[PDB]
Amino acid sequence: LDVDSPAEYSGPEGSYFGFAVDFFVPSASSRMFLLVGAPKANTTQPGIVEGGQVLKCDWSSTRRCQPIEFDATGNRDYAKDDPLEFKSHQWFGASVRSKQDKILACAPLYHWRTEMKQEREPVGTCFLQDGTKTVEYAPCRSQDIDADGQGFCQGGFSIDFTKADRVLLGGPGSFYWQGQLISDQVAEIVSKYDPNVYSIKYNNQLATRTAQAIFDDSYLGYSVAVGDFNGDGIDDFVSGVPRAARTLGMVYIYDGKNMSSLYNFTGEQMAAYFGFSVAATDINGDDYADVFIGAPLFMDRGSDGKLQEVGQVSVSLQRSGDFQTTKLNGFEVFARFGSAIAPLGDLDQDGFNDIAIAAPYGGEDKKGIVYIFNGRSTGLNAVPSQILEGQWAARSMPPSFGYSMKGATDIDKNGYPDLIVGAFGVDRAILYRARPVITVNAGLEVYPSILNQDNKTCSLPGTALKVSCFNVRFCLKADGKGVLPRKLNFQVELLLDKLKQKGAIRRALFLYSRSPSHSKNMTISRGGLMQCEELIAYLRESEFRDKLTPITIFMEYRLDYRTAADTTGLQPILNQFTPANISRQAHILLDCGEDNVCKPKLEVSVDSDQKKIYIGDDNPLTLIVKAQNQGEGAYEAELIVSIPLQADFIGVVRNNEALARLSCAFKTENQTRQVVCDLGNPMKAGTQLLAGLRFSVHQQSEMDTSVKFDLQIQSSNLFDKVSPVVSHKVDLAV
Amino acid sequence: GPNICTTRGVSSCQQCLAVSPMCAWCSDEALPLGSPRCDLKENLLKDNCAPESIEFPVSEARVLEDRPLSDKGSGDSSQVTQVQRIALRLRPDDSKNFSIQVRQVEDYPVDIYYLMDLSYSMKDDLWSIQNLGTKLATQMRKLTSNLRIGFGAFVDKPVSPYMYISPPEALENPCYDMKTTCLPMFGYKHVLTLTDQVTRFNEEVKKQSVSRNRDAPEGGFDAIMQATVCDEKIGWRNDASHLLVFTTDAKTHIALDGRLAGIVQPNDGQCHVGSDNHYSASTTMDYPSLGLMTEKLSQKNINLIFAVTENVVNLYQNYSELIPGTTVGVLSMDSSNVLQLIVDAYGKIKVELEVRDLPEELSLSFNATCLNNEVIPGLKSCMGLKIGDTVSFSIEAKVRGCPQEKEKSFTIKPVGFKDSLIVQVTFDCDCACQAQPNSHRCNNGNGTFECGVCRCGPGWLGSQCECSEEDYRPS
Ligand SMILES: N=C(N)NCCC[C@@H]1NC(=O)[C@H](CCCCN)NC(=O)[C@@H](Cc2ccccc2)NC(=O)[C@@H](CC(=O)O)NC(=O)CNC1=O
Known part of the structure; x- marks a missing residue:
């Protein structure tokens, strides 16, 4: 989904614009729209305050949301004078549903004053719009009056359309808030529509029956969903009952042909509001749809043992087996995770349907968040693929972002499903469009898998210098779907030793461009081939004191950022599982054993010629050191020899064949002064070394009596990297 | 080796007092020839210095008001008490310890x-x-x-x-x-x-x-x-x-x-x-x-x-x-x-215990004797007790130097128990022989023996007027 720049819709301030959302696809034209319900909006109706609106928002390039005029009349008057009806503060637009060219908008809080007595009953009413017609459907406005009947039914609190266009209403208030489910065909509603009679009945309506007083205050119909669970092509009704089972909550599935109960799924914790929202869709790739139940107020025990309110979603897979198969829990307190659920369809087109879940108080600043959970074989993933949060700044009132959701429909026809998120706290709705997914993998290989430290058979171009250059190659291949153009564009970066952090010596270069790193722009035919290229590199001789470790060949690739967007106006995205980062180790061999891991060892000794020195004037001094090596050769060896403060180093003895040709550059950063001599070129196993260092002594007074030396030597490789300390002394005579 | 009192060459009781609270000065005229005047009290006694002529009566603390605590909260005929009051005497750089208990x-x-x-x-x-x-x-x-x-x-x-x-x-x-x-x-x-x-x-x-x-x-x-x-x-x-x-x-x-x-x-x-x-x-x-x-x-x-x-x-x-x-x-x-x-x-x-009105130069340390007679160092609070339980604490006090004021007081304050542990502090930084110029201890007089230095008049100088400016050549 595109989070960087979604499309946002704004309604009148304070309207609750965004309380309900849905897609609209009429048959009269190819035009695409979005329906947003605004239950608190003021209307044109005479003598009605905050009657509610439903606003039509086209997907055109230049558009503003426009209210749908379902009903312009004010409240009906009874015989004589007083009003029959109370349309003020009816929540028209609290629920909005659509089925091709049909729209169902409901006002759960609509009241009416019956005949036979002065009452005020929130029966609730729905308006059903067709391509031409607009009809009223208020099945709970009946002759059964009062809370003992259907007076407080609030029909239309939750609604949905069956695939064959049946209207489904849930009224939580019928029969002392037992709740009720009511449904009719669009044909039945239109056939029996007589606007001049308030208590009209639909002759083939399906409704749940009144039950015992034991079941009061259950709120059956708080939320509804449709799916096939009996297996005969007629969608069944899924209804939430968040206060039943003595407040544990439960969800019923009713046969779509006769309203008889099929299955019950019960919450695990009282007051969790198990059933606040429900959804039905197959997620594990079978033919059979599965059930989702939200419990926004679920509490789970924290580390210290106290209960923490995070919310939870229950998943029931079907072939339906009573006990839930997997759960998703919120990670933040009072987030109300699971307040909304929406099937996304096959969001990533990988072959399994995905779900979207909302927490109207999750995220930073508690603005609310929507979590995308990808489906797959054996159900939903334990972790979300994406998080959506309101990008507008938080304010005093919550945005309630993610309160309402709808997906599984394609708006721009780019081939991927899109999503609608409503935030009625700011009077906004926001549109997220799915971007094309590009799945790719790469290759990285070297012909001389092991690099020789001294082969140097390869010459530089037009230059006398010869180096141990080697041949390397890399590959990249991609696949895509949707309207994704087949000419994909990638950028790949090659690096030889980028892991040499903290400014460590760069040690290798590419032959062309003579640089350690190189960036290559690439273009690939989607799924058309696997493409490879070759390169030449060489080490830069060998001015690096890092032969202890191999070269860290490295590469990374990303989609060509600056490429033009597609026709629909979006840029593709790499699949999350792709290995955008890849590396291999190139080993270095001088003579480091048949196993390529040599095991060095070091021996050393020290002596001095003029072991007696005078005081009061400059006197010469010399130090003699010898080293013996063990193992498969040695390199990087260094004389770490400390020297006193009262003498200065005046060079090694280069002018005798009996002594090794060392090179020295002494350092005096601290009182632990060092002579710092290199032992020269690499040497083979069993080699012996002898050297002599000259010094000048500048003792000023007889307070001192001797001078002392301490030394150490480095190893060939990581094993026994530095030798123990050895010491020597020189005496002062007088 | 020899103690600080003698090794420092103390010349007067004032300096002996200033050196350390453990040092003592012998004012007895019968002290044997050559014996140091400033020394530990046991050494002065060994030298037959009269005990009452030694300038070091040990520091002490004692009660000031010690009414027993109550046993019933009804207060039948008098106000209940749950804390009692003490007085303290100190030498320069001296310290002392004590303990107290409270009851719910x-x-x-x-x-x-x-x-x-x-x-x-x-x-x-x-x-x-x-x-x-x-x-x-x-x-x-x-x-x-x-x-x-x-x-x-x-x-x-x-x-x-x-x-x-x-x-x-x-x-x-x-x-x-x-x-x-x-x-x-x-x-x-x-x-x-x-x-x-x-x-x-x-x-x-x-x-x-x-x-x-x-x-x-x-x-x-x-x-x-x-x-x-x-x-x-x-x-x-x-x-x-x-x-x-x-x-x-x-x-x-x-x-x-x-x-x-x-x-x-x-x-x-x-x-x-x-x-x-x-x-x-x-x-x-x-x-x-x-x-x-x-x-x-x-x-x-x-x-x-x-x-x-x-x-x-x-x-x-x-x-x-x-x-x-x-x-x-x-x-x-x-x-x-x-x-x-x-x-x-x-x-x-x-x-829990608070402290109020503490002197500017006096310090404290606390330890707790909680339920089950368990002892916790450094703590000044105890939890978990019910009505009727009694708990105790121990306090160590120390001063640095000595104030010129003869007396001052402070108190400790448990949270919400209405009672105050007022403690009185007195300082005894003086020598008895110092109560009352032209001392013969100086070189042929010409000086006042106070603070360990004669403070010689015209024509003399030194610790005991042992030199004169005409003989005290710069060389
Ligand atoms: N359709 C149904 N399932 N009807 C069954 C519902 C039964 C449900 N209860 C009853 O009828 C019983 C009749 C016999 C049992 C005594 N309680 N009457 C009551 O419950 C009334 C008055 C009363 C209470 C206690 C003793 C005597 C009388 N109590 C209330 O709390 C009020 C509202 C209030 O003031 O809080 N109404 C309700 O609570 C819901 N209303 C009712 O009617």
Whole structure:
């Protein structure tokens, strides 16, 4: 989904614009729209305050949301004078549903004053719009009056359309808030529509029956969903009952042909509001749809043992087996995770349907968040693929972002499903469009898998210098779907030793461009081939004191950022599982054993010629050191020899064949002064070394009596990297 | 080796005193020839210095007022005491140690707030809640003396689904359609603030009457939230243990129920009780969830108790398991079931020491002797004790230098026990022989023997006037 720049819709301030959302696809034209319900909006109706609106928002390039005029009349008057009806503060637009060219908008809080007595009953009413017609459907406005009947039914609190266009209403208030489910065909509603009679009945309506007083205050119909669970092509009704089972909550599935109960799924914790929202869709790739139940107020025990309110979603897979198969829990307190659920369809087109879940108080600043959970074989993933949060700044009132959701429909026809998120706290709705997914993998290989430290058979171009250059190659291949153009564009970066952090010596270069790193722009035919290229590199001789470790060949690739967007106006995205980062180790061999891991060892000794020195004037001094090596050769060896403060180093003895040709550059950063001599070129196993260092002594007074030396030597490789300390002394005579 | 007192070549009792509090000076004229004047007291005694002629009487501390602590909190004929008072004497750079104990005699403070359901379904339970309220005040007074008790009432949100609004008469008389009379409905009203006048509580409780609404569940949890967070309106005492008793005979509304009435705003968990003592945000905020209630209850340290009828005891038992620390009792004619819970809360109801008016140059150290005679170094507090338990502490004191003031005092202060451990401090930084110029100890006189230096007059100089400027050549 595109989070960087979604499309946002704004309604009148304070309207609750965004309380309900849905897609609209009429048959009269190819035009695409979005329906947003605004239950608190003021209307044109005479003598009605905050009657509610439903606003039509086209997907055109230049558009503003426009209210749908379902009903312009004010409240009906009874015989004589007083009003029959109370349309003020009816929540028209609290629920909005659509089925091709049909729209169902409901006002759960609509009241009416019956005949036979002065009452005020929130029966609730729905308006059903067709391509031409607009009809009223208020099945709970009946002759059964009062809370003992259907007076407080609030029909239309939750609604949905069956695939064959049946209207489904849930009224939580019928029969002392037992709740009720009511449904009719669009044909039945239109056939029996007589606007001049308030208590009209639909002759083939399906409704749940009144039950015992034991079941009061259950709120059956708080939320509804449709799916096939009996297996005969007629969608069944899924209804939430968040206060039943003595407040544990439960969800019923009713046969779509006769309203008889099929299955019950019960919450695990009282007051969790198990059933606040429900959804039905197959997620594990079978033919059979599965059930989702939200419990926004679920509490789970924290580390210290106290209960923490995070919310939870229950998943029931079907072939339906009573006990839930997997759960998703919120990670933040009072987030109300699971307040909304929406099937996304096959969001990533990988072959399994995905779900979207909302927490109207999750995220930073508690603005609310929507979590995308990808489906797959054996159900939903334990972790979300994406998080959506309101990008507008938080304010005093919550945005309630993610309160309402709808997906599984394609708006721009780019081939991927899109999503609608409503935030009625700011009077906004926001549109997220799915971007094309590009799945790719790469290759990285070297012909001389092991690099020789001294082969140097390869010459530089037009230059006398010869180096141990080697041949390397890399590959990249991609696949895509949707309207994704087949000419994909990638950028790949090659690096030889980028892991040499903290400014460590760069040690290798590419032959062309003579640089350690190189960036290559690439273009690939989607799924058309696997493409490879070759390169030449060489080490830069060998001015690096890092032969202890191999070269860290490295590469990374990303989609060509600056490429033009597609026709629909979006840029593709790499699949999350792709290995955008890849590396291999190139080993270095001088003579480091048949196993390529040599095991060095070091021996050393020290002596001095003029072991007696005078005081009061400059006197010469010399130090003699010898080293013996063990193992498969040695390199990087260094004389770490400390020297006193009262003498200065005046060079090694280069002018005798009996002594090794060392090179020295002494350092005096601290009182632990060092002579710092290199032992020269690499040497083979069993080699012996002898050297002599000259010094000048500048003792000023007889307070001192001797001078002392301490030394150490480095190893060939990581094993026994530095030798123990050895010491020597020189005496002062007088 | 030899001690500091002798090795420093002390010349006078003033310098001997200044060197260290452990040093002593012998003022006796009979001291043997050559013996040092400044030395440890045992060495002076070995040299036959008269004990009373030695300038070092050991530092000491002793009582000043030591009334024994009380054993019963009733205070039959005198004010109780729970701490006693001492005086201290010090040398320069001196230190001393001592100990003290405290006891919890007086009864713990307790606050009980009573929430009454006044729904019409409570009409036949009205006597039971009135009876229970009376015996809460009465029976608690036999456990603690300083009780504070108040009460409030709730019915439900006064909005369309719950409230009768159909005929204009129904607003004034919710029982109109039954052709009888009852009071107008209300969300939650605070009636009586926490007070010790139990007789006032009984009279106000017995004059309450039921209102009426439509749906069985009530808005009791709105009252629990407001009683918890409106501390200044309710009057919760910052130091008392807080008990909240909740009564009802029906199930309860919870968060997300307000959506039916058009209420979607979450409960803020803040005080919304005005001067009319009514919950003003009743019709605009949703009911609180169990998670939010548990947060505020723990934050305000309030122990909630449910006193509910049998038919809903299981429903609230499950709620209690999700609100840690709360308990449930059965509401009936016999109120003994719920009274036991109040007894239990009191049966499971702490001291720390402050220091005030400490001198500018005196310091302290503390250690604790907690329950079971366990000793903890550095601690100055003890927890977990009940009424009648006694705990003890030990204190070490030290000074640096010596002030010119002869006497000053400070005190230690336990939290809330009303008593003060006033300690008096005196300083004895002087020598007896120093009470009373032209001393023969100087070179042929010409000097005053004070502070260990003669301070010679004209024509002489040195520690003891041993030199003259004409002989004290610069070379
Ligand atoms: N369709 C159905 N399932 N009807 C069954 C519902 C039964 C459900 N209860 C009853 O009828 C019983 C009749 C016999 C049992 C005594 N309680 N009457 C009541 O419940 C009334 C008054 C009363 C209470 C207690 C004792 C005597 C009389 N109590 C209420 O709390 C009010 C509202 C209020 O003031 O809070 N109404 C409701 O709670 C819901 N209304 C009712 O009608």
